[PDB]
Amino acid sequence: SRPASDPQVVEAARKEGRLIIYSSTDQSSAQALLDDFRKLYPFIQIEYNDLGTQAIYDRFVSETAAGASSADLLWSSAMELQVKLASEGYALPYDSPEAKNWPANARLGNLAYSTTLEPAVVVYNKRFLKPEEVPTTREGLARLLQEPRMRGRVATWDPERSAVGFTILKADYDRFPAFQELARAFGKAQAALYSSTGAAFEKVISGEHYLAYGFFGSYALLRQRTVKDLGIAYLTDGTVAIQRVAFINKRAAHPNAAKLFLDYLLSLRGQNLMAYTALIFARRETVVGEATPQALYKAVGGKDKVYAIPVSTEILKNLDPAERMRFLTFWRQAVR
Ligand SMILES: [Cl-]
Ligand SMILES: [Cl-]
């Protein structure tokens, strides 16, 4: 199909000829979307900057303050940082014609948009834990992590080095009382903390760890295609879902190419390519593939077991110094 971008926006984007992206989306997961968008619009050269969530924020703020060349479009899983920027004058207002039935809590008016509904899952190495050994609750994982064999065998986020690690563990702490028991079991099991999914997965795949808690189901699905021993367990007591936020740089040199790429990401075409080929868990329900809301809800035991973090100015509460203090004081003491 063809994203419903205005023909004037397509022509203005052809005159630009170039799109600069700053994204936290691993290029391995983004590549089929970049390739399909280039098929749709062969007259746009894409520069894809695969970067950490905190680095995207710091670099965009710096380059903007210097009056320097920056990104046309920012795409990041660190929801609070994206909502902060889009609510402080960094976002180009644009009403996507592909976002007409987005819920109000999946967009910041016309400033920024949900592009995904991506669960925080458990991944494990089947050579070391069989599917039957891997509990699907915070209470059951706390019990497994009491076992001597699990000491040194757990990976999770470092929320002090990954801004999305903070997004995901902060939401878990806020919504699930059992997260506290689980965090103390991270301490008991001497959990190693990582600033990226890839660094935690590498250790699970080698067997250095048996289990990783809280990383993107999107990355796990795609890694499974080439790594037979990767298992995925979905939490049935409650699953945190992030929504990768996209917004256009207010000072983009190529605003129209950015509009085309945003509309593509939100379109049936982009969302189906996410669900079927990229194996990024799509935001849209009307999709076919393995990485769908329907597949997520079936695995966790209903939509009511998913807490989707909203794309809302309300989530900036998580950046309040007292709220960061409460979470990080509890966290640091539990996991050491
Ligand atoms: Cl790391
Ligand atoms: Cl939702």
Q: What is the DSSP string of 91-128?
A: BPP---TT-TT--GGGB-TTS-EE-B-EEEEEEEETTT
Binding positions for Mn(2+): 26
Spatial neighbors of 137 by CB under 8 A, at least 6 apart, are 178, 235, 236, 237
Is the CB of residue 175 less than 8 Å from the CB of residue 238? yes
The approach used to solve this structure was: X-ray
d(CA 246, CA 86): 9
Residues 6+ apart with CB under 8 A from 245: 75, 76, 79, 82, 83, 86, 112, 113, 114, 115, 311
Residue 314 Cα to ligand 2 midpoint, Å, equals 15
Ligand 2 centre and the CA of 308: distance in Å?
A: 5
Distance 194 CA to ligand 1 centre (A): 4
Q: Which residues contact 176 (CB under 8 A, 6 or more apart)?
A: 138, 237, 238
Neighbours of 28 (CB within 10 A): 15
Tell me the ligand closest to 202's alpha carbon. 1
Ligand positioned closest to the Cα atom of 312: 2
Helix axes 79-86, 163-175, angle to 10 degrees: 110
Rounded to the nearest angstrom, the distance between the alpha carbon of 193 and the centre of ligand 1 is 7
214 CA from centroid of ligand 1 (Å): 14
Q: How many CB atoms lie within 10 A of CB 314?
A: 11
The amino acid sitting at 311 is V
**Tokens standing for 76?**
């990041």
List residues forming the annotated binding site: 24, 26
How far CA 3 is from CA of 10, 21, 89, 129, 245, in Å, comes to 11, 19, 27, 44, 19
Judged by its nearest atom, the ligand closest to the C-alpha of residue 284 is 2
The answer to whether 80 and 53 have CB atoms below 8 angstroms apart is: no
Residue 166 C-alpha to ligand 2 middle, in angstroms?
A: 20
Q: Which ligand is nearest to the CA of 161?
A: 1
Give the residue ranges of DSSP H helices in 76-211: 79-86, 138-144, 163-175, 178-188, 197-206
Return the ligand number nearest the Cα of 307: 2
Residue 196 C-alpha to ligand 1 middle, in angstroms? 6
Annotated binding-site residue numbers for Mg(2+): 24, 26
199 C-alpha vs ligand 1 centroid, how far in Å? 6
User: From ligand 1's centre to the CA of 212, what distance in Å?
Assistant: 13
CA distances from 55 to 52, 60, 166 (A): 5, 8, 14
Q: State the distance from the centre of ligand 2 to the C-alpha of 324, rounded, in angstroms.
A: 25
Residues shown for the chain = 336
Distance CA 65, CA 60 (A): 9
Which ligand is closest in space to the CA of residue 195? 1
From the CA of 309, how far away is ligand 2's center (Å)?
Answer: 8
